[PDB]
């Protein structure tokens, strides 16, 4: 395509999964989209205290073209509510959608999303906004001063988070300790109405 960025895929699960993951950061706020040859990233921040970055690499798309030359990456800002409503209305017939294409033509142009079916194509253009002065890179891990590291199975952590949510947890404490004989202790301690 003639656009500066154009990526098309046949797996609609990735997009809806990304929106689902971004939802907990607020149904009505801004989302930053970073585009580069490596891939496309969604970034959200809350209260200057928490940040989420979800990456979609080239491999996830059956076609991926990034023709920009002046800049190695492109930054834009959109409203999450617009995308959420548009996708919810367009994704009602999820069984029939066969292709999804994202496109962008640089600063001053909208972010274009096209759902292509067998005979019907729906094209939506999202207006873009100036990016806030706050830098997403500000909140980052100091790779040279790690206090501790741990690897956990997704299912167990998700179950623990569910349990904490169901008891109305108000404060959380991550406790990590190591001893000899390969003894390890990782725990989550919750302060809630239960105590």
């Amino acid at each position: 395509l003639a656009n500066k960025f154009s990526a098309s895929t046949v797996h609609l699960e990735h997009i809806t999964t990304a929106l689902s993951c971004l939802t907990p950061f607020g149904s009505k706020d801004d989302v930053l989209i970073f585009i580069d040859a490596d891939g496309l990233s969604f970034v959200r921040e809350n209260n200057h205290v928490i940040k989420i970055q979800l990456l979609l690499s080239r491999e996830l798309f059956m076609s991926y073209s990034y023709r920009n030359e002046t800049e190695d990456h492109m930054k834009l800002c959109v409203k999450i509510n617009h995308i959420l409503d548009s996708v919810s209305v367009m994704n009602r017939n999820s069984d029939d959608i066969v292709e999804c294409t994202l496109s962008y033509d640089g600063h001053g142009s909208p972010f274009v999303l096209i759902f292509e079916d067998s005979f019907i194509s729906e094209r939506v253009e999202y207006s873009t906004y100036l990016i806030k002065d706050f830098d997403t890179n500000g909140l980052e891990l100091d790779r040279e001063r790690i206090s501790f590291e741990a690897i956990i199975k997704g299912e167990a952590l998700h179950s623990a988070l569910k349990d904490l949510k169901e008891i109305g947890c108000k404060e959380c404490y991550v406790y990590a300790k190591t001893e000899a004989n390969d003894e390890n202790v990782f725990a989550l301690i919750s302060k809630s109405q239960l105590g």
Partner: protein, 316 residues
């Protein structure tokens, strides 16, 4: 003023379906409908310029400008006795749509039950009450069910003021819609009704662009995000204080666009679902015409026609 008509649904079901669709459309469009019984065909009109309809002031209050015209050849009725001393033995009347719709619904129920009787329609002078007469309708039910409907006859002067809208054919782009019974019929039916998924959308922008050699798009700009719905399947093109409306200059010689109301589009979708041969005509920034044609042959017979004219809801 003898208007003896016999209607049978077991013979030529296409004509009965056409009549049912016509009455349903006129009932859903306006409260009252005009019936013109000529020596050759019956014309059913739903227009805001009628004496009864104009009593609602629809045009000024809600912009009810669309006009529905339906033609039924005399061959539809088993018996067609229409004798008059007017031009071409024409008799004009105005009737209420709800009563006719209820009577036809009862007839449909009786037919579905298993009866194969015929409906006799005549004009009668009711002594109970532009004199007002009654439409005596009767039919057997395997019991002689008879119902009467008020009707108001019209004069020649009143009749002549109701004239079918015409369009500038030379400045008019027509598209032959895919047949509903075809493999693409379901796809086009879904494409037409797609915009209904957005409740808050009131106006839709229809666009037609050359280069199956043309394409049709529905644009919605009432939402927080611009929306375009495109049809990529096959689609063939057929080859006082009053002032004229202002027309925006066409972007190109091969693009025709018009903005219309969503209700008119729903009516067009229903009409498209009803019939097989449908043509959509656009007069750029002027109007949209939905023409449903039913073809029957024996010496080809008369073609059943339903033409719905929709004026633009907004300027371009």
């Amino acid at each position: 003023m003898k208007l003896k008509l016999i209607v049978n649904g077991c013979e030529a079901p296409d004509d009965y379906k056409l009549l049912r669709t016509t009455i349903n459309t006129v009932a859903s469009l306006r409260k009252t409908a005009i019936l013109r019984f000529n020596s050759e065909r019956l014309t059913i009109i739903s227009t805001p310029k009628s004496s009864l309809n104009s009593s609602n002031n629809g045009t000024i209050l809600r912009g009810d400008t669309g006009q529905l015209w339906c033609t039924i050849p005399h061959d539809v009725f088993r018996l067609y006795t229409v004798i008059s001393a007017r031009e071409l033995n024409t008799i004009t009347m105005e009737c209420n749509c709800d009563s006719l719709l209820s009577v036809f619904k009862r007839y449909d129920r009786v037919m579905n039950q298993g009866s194969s009787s015929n409906m006799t329609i005549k004009l009668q002078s009711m002594p109970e009450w532009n004199p007002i007469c009654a439409l005596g309708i009767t039919f057997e039910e395997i019991i002689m069910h008879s119902f009467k409907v008020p009707v108001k006859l019209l004069f020649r002067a009143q009749d002549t003021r109701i004239q079918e809208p015409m369009i500038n054919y030379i400045q008019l782009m027509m598209y032959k819609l895919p047949p509903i019974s075809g493999e693409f019929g379901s796809a086009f039916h879904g494409f037409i009704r797609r915009v209904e998924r957005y409740s808050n959308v009131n106006h839709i922008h229809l666009m037609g662009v050359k280069k199956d050699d043309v394409e049709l798009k529905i644009i919605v700009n009432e939402l927080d995000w611009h929306l375009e719905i495109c049809w990529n399947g096959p689609l063939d093109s057929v080859i006082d204080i009053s002032v004229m409306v202002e027309k925006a200059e066409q972007e190109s010689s091969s693009t025709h666009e018009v903005i219309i109301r969503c209700k008119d589009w729903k009516v067009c979708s229903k009409l498209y679902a009803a019939f097989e041969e449908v043509v959509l005509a656009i007069s750029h920034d002027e109007s949209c015409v939905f023409h449903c044609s039913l073809d029957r042959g024996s010496k080809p017979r008369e073609r059943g026609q339903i033409i719905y004219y929709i004026a633009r809801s907004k300027g371009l």
